[PDB]
């Protein structure tokens, strides 16, 4: 009695790492972004 995963653990451990990290990167790619100057503000005119 042993254990071995071949077809659908490493599938979901490639869909975990996809959805967990394609979500955090979409988050940082979707926000307004850091202003980088005093005039710039997060969430502003335009």
């Amino acid at each position: 009695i042993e254990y071995y995963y071949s077809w659908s653990f490493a599938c979901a451990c490639a869909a975990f790492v996809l959805l967990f990290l394609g979500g955090i990167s979409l988050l940082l790619f979707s926000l307004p972004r850091m202003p980088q100057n005093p005039w710039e503000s997060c969430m502003d005119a335009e």
């Binding site: 980088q36 005039w39 502003d44």
Partner: protein
């Protein structure tokens, strides 16, 4: 002074009494009492020597002397309240407090016949501060610099709390099981191993000791002190980790119990985040504060105090050189020795015989040949008389008087006199086995003679003597702090480290000298947690009051280190300032003097040139660097190591293709592209080449332009450190020699400390487990040598580097204090005066280290702004306010329409809401830090009643917010998104905890993250946070250098030491090793943080037991180790340190605008609040607003930006029309240009006709306008 209405002068000539010596008699009295609190000897269990009694008797005298003066100052001054005038001063309050407290304790004691009230006497030294009116001022500047650290304090406090709670849940009660011998109640552990958690079935570690089983009634990892059972212990352990001392210990215990797959995240993040980040922020704010203070001095009057007197001294020596040659200017050979002394022959042949005496000292080692000893003494003999004659010929050849004149000459007198003084001394017969040595080293002093020819050294020395002269008053305070804590130590811990074990605790507070050393030790932070544990055990253990002693150590460390900060920062700031100031002054002195005497081939370039080619190649470096890191060290016969070898032969065909195509078009960085490609094809001494195969990640420094330019800058930082490094490396060497003269052949000892000779340590001896005269095992006796010693000059030096990194320096210190005679084992507490050597070295090194670090900073500054100039009509404060006024912009408030939605919007935006929510989040916090290990079942369910009820409340606030922002403006605020995230997760958590019991320790972490909302209101913390979090993004290449550092090293590391077996009790084990890539990187981080790296270095040396998996001729298991571990480790340490100081400087500088802002006058902090009032007049931006709301805008403004605390009828009515503004249609004046003349008024204020001249300047020194200034010109 005079009361002006007191009682008459029937006795009130007390104000006559107090003239000159009563201020000094009392001072020496407060000094003698200090000398008395220190000669005291704390004895355990109530014993007492007859001298302590004598001291208590003298105590009464001391008391009566401090108690009458506290009445003779409420006589002078005036009545109850005029004495209050005495009390008016803050210091008197302390004086009164002292004496009062004293007699109080005395009387109490008497009546009884309290052992605590005696701990308040260690306060009297403070009184030594009221006296010296200088110390007062320093104590003042220390409290003012600490005022702007409030925002960082909040942050650090909340960081510890958050981590503490996460720690709590995460590992609360998971460390109570340890390996036990079966049936017995004894802990099973190897030799140099610490008892650690264990686990029966699971990810944790299992029992490995024979006849050992996993039990579970264990108090904890450090005598039940380090764990996460409640909020208090959790908090303590977290702070301990944040200080960076013993953090890996905690990380390993959590692994050993939960599995190593996840607890690493928590810890690394902590050390990184908390520790390093916080350090940066604190170093930054302080630096800023110091700069402003210096600026306050230099612009007031302090530049001309140090320029004149440095010029009036160099004009004095020029005046006195015009005299001393006029006074000086019998036979012919006495003039031929005048020609020679100043020549260039004699300069190159004083360096000849000084180099023979440096070589001899270095030559001195333990067990040296007989011809060597002979030769050394021979040379010194062939030199004492050679030193006799030149001195003899010098003082008689050019005059007996002006020989006295030379600073250098005075020392040449001292050499031969004490050089020949030891000639008959060592011959007399006294000396002994320690003096005949201290004499020998002195010969080292002759190198100083060369200083005479070393002009640089002479000056840099005065430069160094100036900084140490200014911080003189700060330094005294540091010592005063140390003495006081040493005394408090003697009081809480003196005579209590009396546990019935055979374990020796060298760091205690038994007497004054020892207590001093322990305090210094806790101050360097080396092993401070271990020192604290002893103190805790001295009060019963980790229980209620018993633990409260740990507050002593916390305070000590923290505060003492704050004083250290001041010292170092002050030294740097004053020092850096002088260097910029006088080096530039000697530069304006420089060239003003030198002006006076003067007065088919194309498509392969297309592909190579093409941009896509690069993104196709820089992800073959991303694959080939994953193939170096996936290699298996121990087993070369693996299928993994074979099938990665085909990935070797894949890519190094392709970089060949890149190479040959590159020499189809073109005919230093490309000799590196040739080398990498050849190495693989050759590798398919082979062993040596393989290490040189990790160089591939270094071929990506040319492809990217960002990387190329920063290795250039780093290489330029190691060119402006010459005179200082020279002084420093001279220091290291000299101290190494002193060490060899003091501890040569004295770092040897026996297994059982009974045998003192090598002859004696033969045979076998008994060892006793837990000091049980009934439980003993047999062991062979062996004469061992300490790993770090002072046998030769290359050894003493390695020792000093480690003592300089503060890693394991107390061990060395104690071995030295125990040193006996050459070839003889230790004698407990033999010579405690060696501690002096150790402490002085540490101090001097700290000083010189700082200077070198600061100089590197100055070079970088020159690379940046220091080199640059901007002499246009607009200064610093104009560029950071006008360019902001050009590039500004509107906002988005979203005031919506209608009463039902608008009213809802109002409740939620009301202050009753802010405060309420805040209060609720505070309560939730308090309810989280309430969980502990082993609570009740009624406590168990109301925690699920509450966590579902808090979710409710929060999901009920979000609803309101959503209803009041149509979901368009709700998800518009970056904080609302965070709110949403928290809510959803918190709910899922509840539902989970539910579907669990109806029929994931990651969701219970959503409760804790709520605290981050608090950061939504704190505007100073948020602001500071953003400021720095914004710089770490402007400099992403330096961080890349660090990353690349760890990568190369990890790879080389694996290769070099990836086969050493993981044996317990050693430094290479299951928690620390080079077996896998991730593990190697963890090890290096551990090293960068300075956690016992020197012990690792030794663990990675030659004769190490090989992993069973690795192959080897039956009889070669012990051939695995490499003495290359010395170059690897030292080099990694240094390079690492270098890169780190280069990242802090970078960030700090790029942020100096906000740091040294002097928030008084102006910043963008006024320019922010303008728009946040303008947001109430703009829903969305649109540019302009009505003119009816313009006058109501100026009523909302702070008066340093707008108009006063006066009424706006006269100044604010007249100025708004008279100062310029653009005139468009009736209710249209723009955002973009109203803010201009509103800040053009407040500073940079101009006369009429030249309204084009402000617009003239706003195009040259400013960036291209972009066409927006055409309304900001008019």
């Amino acid at each position: 002074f005079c009361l002006t209405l007191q009682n008459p002068l029937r006795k009130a000539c007390i104000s006559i009494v107090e003239w000159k010596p009563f201020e000094t008699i009392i001072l020496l009295t407060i000094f003698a009492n200090c000398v008395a609190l220190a000669v005291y000897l704390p004895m355990p269990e109530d014993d007492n020597n007859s001298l302590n009694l004598g001291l208590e008797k003298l105590e009464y005298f001391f008391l009566t002397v401090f108690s009458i003066e506290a009445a003779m100052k409420i006589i002078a001054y005036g009545f109850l309240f005029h004495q209050d005038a005495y009390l008016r001063s803050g210091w008197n309050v302390l004086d009164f407090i002292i004496v009062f407290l004293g007699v109080f304790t005395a009387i109490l004691e008497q009546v009884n016949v309290v052992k605590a009230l005696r701990a308040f006497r260690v306060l009297r030294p403070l009184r030594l501060v009221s006296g010296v009116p200088s110390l007062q001022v320093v104590l003042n500047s220390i409290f003012k610099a600490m005022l702007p650290l409030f925002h960082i304090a909040l942050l650090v406090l909340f960081m510890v709390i958050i981590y503490a709670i996460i720690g709590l849940e995460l590992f609360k009660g998971k460390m109570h099981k340890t390996c036990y011998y079966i049936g017995t109640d004894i802990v099973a552990t190897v030799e140099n191993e610490k008892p650690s958690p264990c686990a029966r079935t699971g990810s944790g570690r299992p029992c490995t000791i024979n006849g050992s089983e996993c039990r579970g009634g264990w108090p904890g990892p450090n005598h039940g002190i380090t764990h996460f059972d409640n909020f208090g212990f959790s908090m303590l352990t977290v702070y301990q980790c944040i200080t960076m001392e013993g953090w890996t210990d905690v990380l390993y215990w959590v692994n050993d119990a939960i599995g190593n797959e996840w607890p690493w995240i928590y810890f690394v993040t902590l050390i990184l985040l908390g520790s390093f980040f916080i350090l940066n922020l604190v170093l930054g704010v302080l630096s800023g504060e110091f700069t402003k203070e210096r600026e306050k001095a230099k612009s007031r009057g302090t530049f001309q105090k140090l320029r004149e007197k440095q010029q009036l001294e160099e004009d004095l020596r020029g005046y006195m050189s015009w005299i001393t040659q006029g006074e000086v200017m019998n036979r012919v050979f006495r003039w031929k020795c005048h020609d020679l002394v100043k020549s260039r022959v004699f300069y190159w042949l004083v360096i000849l015989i000084v180099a023979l005496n440096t070589l001899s000292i270095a030559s001195e080692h333990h067990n040296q040949p007989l011809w060597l000893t002979h030769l050394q003494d021979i040379a010194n003999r062939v030199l004492l008389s050679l030193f006799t004659i030149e001195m003899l010929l010098k003082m008689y050849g050019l005059g007996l008087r002006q020989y006295f004149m030379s600073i250098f000459n005075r020392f040449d007198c001292f050499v031969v006199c004490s050089g020949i003084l030891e000639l008959l001394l060592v011959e007399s017969g006294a000396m002994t086995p320690l003096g005949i040595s201290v004499l020998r080293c002195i010969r080292l002093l002759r190198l100083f003679k060369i200083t005479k020819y070393w002009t640089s050294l002479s000056n840099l020395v005065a430069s160094l003597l100036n900084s140490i002269r200014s911080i003189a008053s700060l330094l005294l305070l540091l010592f005063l702090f140390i003495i006081i804590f040493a005394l408090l130590g003697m009081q809480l811990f003196g005579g209590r480290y009396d546990f019935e074990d055979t374990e020796v605790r060298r760091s205690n507070f038994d007497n004054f000298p020892q207590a001093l050393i322990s305090v210094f030790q806790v101050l360097t932070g080396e092993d401070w947690n271990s020192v604290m544990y002893n103190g805790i055990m001295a009060y019963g253990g980790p229980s209620y009051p018993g633990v409260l002693v740990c507050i002593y150590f916390i305070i000590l460390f923290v505060c003492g280190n704050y004083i250290l900060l001041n010292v170092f920062l002050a030294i740097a700031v004053d020092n850096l300032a002088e260097a910029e100031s006088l080096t530039s002054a000697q530069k304006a002195k420089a060239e003003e003097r030198k002006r006076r005497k003067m007065s088919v081939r194309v498509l392969c370039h297309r592909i190579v040139n093409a941009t896509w080619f690069t993104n196709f190649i820089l992800l073959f470096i991303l694959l080939s660097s994953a193939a170096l890191a996936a290699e298996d060290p121990i087993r070369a016969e693996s299928v993994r190591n074979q099938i990665l070898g085909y990935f070797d032969i894949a890519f190094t065909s392709v970089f060949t293709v890149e190479i040959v195509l590159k020499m189809t078009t073109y005919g230093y960085f490309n000799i590196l592209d040739l080398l990498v490609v050849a190495v693989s094809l050759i590798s398919m001494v082979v062993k040596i080449l393989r290490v040189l195969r990790v160089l591939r990640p270094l071929r990506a420094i040319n492809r990217a332009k960002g990387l190329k330019h920063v290795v250039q800058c780093v290489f330029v930082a190691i060119r402006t450190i010459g005179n200082i490094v020279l002084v420093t490396t001279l220091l290291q060497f000299m101290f190494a020699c002193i060490g060899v003269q003091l501890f040569k052949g004295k770092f040897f000892s026996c297994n059982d400390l009974s045998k003192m000779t090598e002859e004696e340590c033969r045979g076998y001896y008994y060892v006793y487990k837990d000091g049980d005269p009934t439980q003993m095992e047999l062991r062979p006796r062996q004469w061992i040598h300490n790993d770090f010693h002072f046998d030769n000059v290359l050894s003493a030096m390695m020792s000093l580097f480690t003592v300089s990194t503060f890693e394991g320096w107390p061990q060395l210190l104690y071995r030295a204090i125990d040193s006996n005679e050459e070839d003889m084992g230790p004698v407990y507490n033999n010579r405690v005066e060696m501690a002096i050597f150790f402490i002085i070295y540490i101090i001097l090194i700290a000083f010189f280290m700082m200077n070198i670090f600061v100089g590197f900073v100055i070079v970088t500054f020159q690379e940046q702004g220091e080199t640059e100039y901007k002499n246009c009509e607009l200064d610093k404060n104009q560029r950071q306010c006008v360019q902001y006024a050009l590039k500004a912009r509107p906002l988005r408030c979203y005031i919506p329409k209608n009463p039902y939605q608008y009213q809802v919007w109002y409740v939620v935006t009301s202050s009753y809401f802010e405060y309420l929510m805040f209060a609720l989040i505070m309560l939730n916090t308090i309810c989280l830090g309430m969980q502990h290990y082993h609570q009740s079942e009624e406590m168990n369910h109301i925690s699920d009643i509450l966590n579902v009820a808090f979710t409710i409340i929060f999901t009920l606030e979000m609803i309101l917010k959503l209803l009041a922002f149509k979901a368009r403006g709700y998800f518009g605020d970056p904080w609302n998104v965070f709110d949403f995230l928290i809510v959803i997760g918190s709910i899922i958590d509840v539902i989970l905890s539910e579907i669990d019991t109806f029929l994931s320790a990651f969701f219970r972490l959503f409760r804790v993250m709520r605290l981050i909302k608090l950061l939504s209101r704190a505007e100073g913390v948020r602001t500071l946070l953003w400021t720095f979090i914004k710089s770490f993004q402007a400099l992403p290449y330096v961080a890349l250098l660090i990353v690349m550092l760890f990568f190369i090293y990890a790879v080389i590391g694996m290769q070099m030491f990836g086969k050493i077996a993981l044996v317990d009790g050693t430094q290479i084990n299951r928690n620390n090793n080079f077996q896998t890539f991730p593990q190697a990187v963890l090890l290096l981080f551990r090293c960068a943080t300075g956690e016992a790296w020197q012990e690792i270095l030794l663990a990675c040396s030659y004769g190490k037991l090989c992993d069973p998996e690795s192959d080897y001729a039956p009889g070669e298991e012990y051939t695995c180790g490499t003495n290359f571990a010395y170059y690897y480790f030292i080099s990694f340490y240094m390079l690492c340190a270098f890169l780190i100081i280069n990242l802090f400087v970078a960030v700090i500088m790029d942020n100096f605008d906000y740091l040294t802002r002097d928030w008084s006058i102006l910043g963008p902090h006024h320019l922010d609040e303008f728009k946040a009032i303008w947001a109430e007049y703009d829903p969305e931006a649109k540019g302009r607003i009505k003119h009816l709301d313009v006058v109501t805008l100026l009523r909302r403004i702070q008066p340093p930006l707008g108009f006063g605390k006066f009424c706006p009828h006269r100044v604010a009515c007249k100025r708004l029309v008279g100062m310029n503004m653009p005139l468009n249609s009736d209710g249209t004046v723009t955002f973009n240009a109203t803010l201009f003349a509103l800040v053009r008024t407040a500073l940079k204020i101009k006369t009429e006709g030249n309204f084009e001249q402000a617009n003239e300047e706003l195009r040259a020194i400013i960036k291209k306008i972009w066409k927006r200034t055409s309304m900001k010109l008019l």
